[PDB]
Amino acid sequence: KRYLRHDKPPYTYLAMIALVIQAAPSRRLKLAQIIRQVQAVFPFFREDYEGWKDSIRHNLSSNRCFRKVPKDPAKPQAKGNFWAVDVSLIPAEALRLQNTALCRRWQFAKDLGPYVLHGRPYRPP
DNA sequence: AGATTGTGGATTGCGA
DNA sequence: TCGCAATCCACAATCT
Ligand SMILES: [K+]
């Protein structure tokens, strides 16, 4: 299939995943919860493109900041892991608002650092 | 069997 | 001009 950019929130997948994880009482979430929460918290995805869900899954594995946490520490788990974030491994620029066409046509928090790094609750207009 | 989680090779578009 | 997030896809192992 032809590569296409699709409308999405103007924050990295890393940032959005980290934000919803850090907002979870236990600071960890499963994949399906991460997907539902990202869309809920950043509702700039379109009904006609589902591939952002694959990109979320890809970002959990591709970024060192995400940690696969087994239900039982003593028993690693092929599947169904919780995901946590090591904020020390988040690149600083990863949390910055992105200057995309979608950002520009709407003009958003300038940086998600308060919510990911400093325990603040995310509450967008 | 088919769907899902987890991983990862690889190319793209586009902001800087 | 090109770094790099975004994105398309394949696959292994496991869940339903
Ligand atoms: K990871």
Residue numbers in the entry: 26 to 132, 140 to 157
Task: Copy text from the publication.
Forkhead box H1 (FoxH1) is an essential maternal pioneer factor during embryonic development that binds to specific GG/GT-containing DNA target sequences. The members of the FOX transcription factor family share the presence of the forkhead domain (FH), which interacts with DNA (InterPro entry IPR001766). In contrast, FoxH1 recognizes the TGTG(G/T)ATT sequences in several cis-regulatory elements, such as in Gsc, Eomes, Nodal, Mixl, and FoxA2, to confer activin regulation in vivo.
To decipher how FoxH1 selects GK sites and how the extended domain contributes to DNA binding, we determined the crystal structures of FoxH1 proteins from three selected species, H. sapiens, D. rerio, and X. laevis, bound to a 16 bp native sequence belonging to the mouse Gsc promoter containing the GG site. The three GG complexes were refined at 0.98 Å (D. rerio, C2 space group), 1.47 Å (H. sapiens, P21 space group), and 2.8 Å resolution (X. laevis, P212121 space group). The root-mean-square deviations (RMSD) between the three vertebrate GG complexes range from 0.47 to 0.65 Å, indicating high structural conservation between the proteins. Although the human construct includes the engrailed homology 1 motif (EH1), this part is not defined in the complex, thereby suggesting that this region does not belong to the globular FH domain. Wing2 starts with two 310 helices (H4 and H5), followed by an isolated β-bridge formed by Lys185 and Asp202 in zebrafish and by Arg121 and Asp143 in humans. In the human and frog sequences, which are longer at the C-terminus, we detected a short coil fragment that turns back and runs antiparallel to H8. This insertion cannot be accurately traced in the human structure due to intrinsic flexibility.
